[PDB]
Every structure is written in C-alpha cells, then in structure tokens.
Amino acid sequence: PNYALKFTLAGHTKAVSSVKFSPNGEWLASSSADKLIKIWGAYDGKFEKTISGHKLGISDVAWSSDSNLLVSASDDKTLKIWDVSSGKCLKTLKGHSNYVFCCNFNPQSNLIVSGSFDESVRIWDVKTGKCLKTLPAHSDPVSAVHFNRDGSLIVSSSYDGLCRIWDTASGQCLKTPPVSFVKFSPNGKYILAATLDNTLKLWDYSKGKCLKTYTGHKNEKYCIFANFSVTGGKWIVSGSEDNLVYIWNLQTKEIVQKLQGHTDVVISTACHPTENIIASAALENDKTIKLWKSDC
Ligand SMILES: CCn1cc(-c2cc(Cn3ccnc3C)cc3c2CCc2c-3nnn2Cc2ccc(F)c(C)c2)c(C(F)(F)F)n1
C-alpha cells in the first residue's frame, strides 16, 4: 500500500482516545479526554459537529449498524447513546461502578456490550437503556469487548492476562502479560489479540491456536486499537508508542508500511469500510486525527 496523509483533523483539546468510521462510510467519529465527541467527514475530514454531555473524559465510541446512533464510554461511569443527526443524548446507561473503557453495538444493534475498570462486562438493551446482564468477566480492568458477526459471541480481554469468549444469549463463558486489545475478524473465524509485550497475534478461535504473530511496533504501556484492513490488500493495522501507524501483511507478517506524521503515541486507528482510507489519532502532545489514503 501507499497510504499518504491527506487531512489533519484538529479540534480536540486533550488526547484523542478512539476514532471509528460509520458503517455507511460517510462519517468518522472521535472521542477524547476533553469529554467531547466530534463527527468529521470520512473522505475529506471536514468538521461536522461536536457532541457533548459526558461529565468526564471518554475512552471509546462505536456506531450502530445503520450509522444513525453512537454509543460512548466514559470515566463518569456511564455510557451514552446518541442520535448522531441531532447530537442529542437518547439514553444514559448506568450500572458500572468504575470507568467505562470500551463499547460496541452488536450487528443487529439491539444490544450494546461494555467493559469497565470495575472488571465486569455488561450487556445493555438499546431501546430501553437497561442493563440486561452483568458478566463477572475478569479480575482486572476490561480492555476490549467485541461482538462477532451475528452477535451470538462476545470476545473480551483484560489486564488479568485473559481473553474470553462469551455466549451473548446466556452470558456464560464458552472458552478462555496483559491482553490490551481483542476483536473478531471480518469473517468471524479469527480473533486478533494485542499483548503489552509489543506483540499482536491472530488466533483461530474455533481451534484455539495462534496462526500469525506480528511484531516491529512498540506496545508496552497503552491499550491500542488494531484493525483488519480488507478493502484492498489484506493487512493488519495498529497504532504504536513510537508515534507510527504500522501496517503488516496478514499472511506473511511482513511490515509493508509505516505511516509517519503523528507526534505522540498513536492510540487508535480505523479502516474505512469500502475505500482504502485509514484514520489515526494520537495522545496529548498531538491531539489530532489524521486521514491517510492509499491507491491500493
Ligand atoms: C477517559 C479519557 N481517556 C481514555 C483514554 C484511553 C484510550 C485508550 C484507547 N482505547 C480506548 C478503548 N479501547 C482502547 C484500545 C487506551 C487508554 C486510555 C487511557 C487509559 C489507558 C489506556 N491504555 N492503557 N491505559 C492505562 C490502563 C491501566 C490499566 C488497565 F487495566 C487499563 C485497561 C488501562 C485516553 C487517552 F487517549 F488519553 F489515552 N483518554
């Protein structure tokens, strides 16, 4: 690939914590320690709106499948569901007893999953805003939560060193160095897992075996989002503590590009759902989001 900087998105006044493309490809949402959500054009980075209401900083945000709703996870111990068009907070999800770190809708988008410093994973009904289940998932803060492609499975990770797979319907555990990030692959068959020893691993979840290992980046301190890029060449994409975006060939594990431009830890990356476009965001020395485009 030949990802090249096209736009730099400024506006947040503290570290940016997460960026996510809307499933319809129109928008990029960002969250920040500055308690704000910002929406930007996905293709030209054009600032669209600020969404406000959380009383403390935000760690994560995620889109509904129809791109109409956002959910945000905050240090104020709540999640908020937002109508993106109006910017209004529709529901406040109350129940966690510590910071909410990570969140995601299921594909049907009737449910939200959340992970917290209170070591629990919670499952929420989008329409009532009520907590359906509280999973005693981990013995340390939960670093990632993600649904598989039909919402039947939740994968979670934690600084307790574990990755667990949960049955959404029953909340019961199906299968079991800090694990700083996990997420299901685009075909459902794999889980990509980060550990705080500068290592990413591709796991066959059905077989329970590590298939590929990716190294070269720096990751000993922060939970950093990683991604599958599927619109062109099949890559793994991750931020890094040396301020670079790393892009590996999924099959060969070779680094194929390093994106230079940020001036702090690249805490979050995201891949556009249909075009060869990457968003990246960095910590407090930088506070900008960068949009990179590749011809392949
Ligand atoms: C509330 C405002 N806010 C949150 C963050 C933030 C964002 C992300 C990116 N992220 C978010 C969700 N999923 C991912 C990959 C990661 C971190 C942080 C700040 C805290 C943190 C992060 N990684 N490690 N720690 C210390 C730590 C120690 C023990 C633990 F068990 C755990 C779990 C963490 C930020 C900032 F962007 F500034 F970092 N601001």
Residue numbers in the entry: 33 to 208, 215 to 334
Task: Give the published text.
Genetic and pharmacological evidence suggests that the nuclear scaffolding protein WD-repeat containing protein 5 (WDR5) is a therapeutic vulnerability of the CSC population. Previously reported WDR5 WIN-site inhibitors contain a tri-substituted amide core with an Arg-mimicking “S2” group, which penetrates to the bottom of the WD40-domain central cavity, and two additional “S4” and “S7” substituents that make interactions with pockets along the surface of WDR5 (chemical structures in **[Fig fig1]**, binding pose in **[Fig fig1]**). Herein, we describe a small series of WDR5 inhibitors containing a tricyclic triazole as a core amide isostere. These triazole-based inhibitors potently inhibit WDR5, maintain a conserved binding mode in the WIN-site, exhibit passive permeability, and, in some cases, improve brain penetration.
We prepared analogs with two distinct S4 groups: a low molecular weight cyclopropyl (**C3TD343**, K_i_ = 5.9 nM) and an elaborated trifluoromethyl pyrazole (**C3TD078**, K_i_ = 0.030 nM, **[Fig fig1]**). As expected, the congener **C3TD078** was found to be more potent, with an equivalent K_i_ to the comparator **C16** (**[Fig fig1]**). The triazole analogs **C3TD343** and **C3TD078** were found to have favorable permeability (MDCK P_app_ > 2) and measurable free fraction of ∼2%. Representative data for a potent compound (**C3TD078**, K_d_ = 2 nM) and a weak compound (**C3TD343**, K_d_ = 200 nM) are provided in **[Fig fig4]**. We also deployed the CETSA in washout experiments to establish the profoundly long off-rate of **C3TD078**, which remained bound to WDR5 for at least 21 hours following compound removal (**[Fig fig4]**). Across both cell lines and all five genes, the average IC_50_ = 80 nM for **C3TD078**-induced transcriptional downregulation, which closely matches reported IC_50_ values for **C16**’s transcriptional activity in MLLr leukemia cells. Taken together, these RT-qPCR data align with the CETSA and support potent on-target inhibition of WDR5 by triazole-based WIN-site inhibitors in CSCs. We also characterized the potent but only peripherally bioavailable triazole **C3TD078** in proliferation assays and a flank xenograft, but we consistently observed unremarkable CSC killing. Our work emphasizes a considerable challenge for the field: WDR5 inhibitors must have exquisitely potent direct affinity to have any functional effects in cells. For example, **C3TD078^’^**s potency right-shifts from biochemical TR-FRET K_i_ = 30 pM, to cellular CETSA K_d_ = 1.6 nM, to functional RT-qPCR IC_50_ = 80 nM.
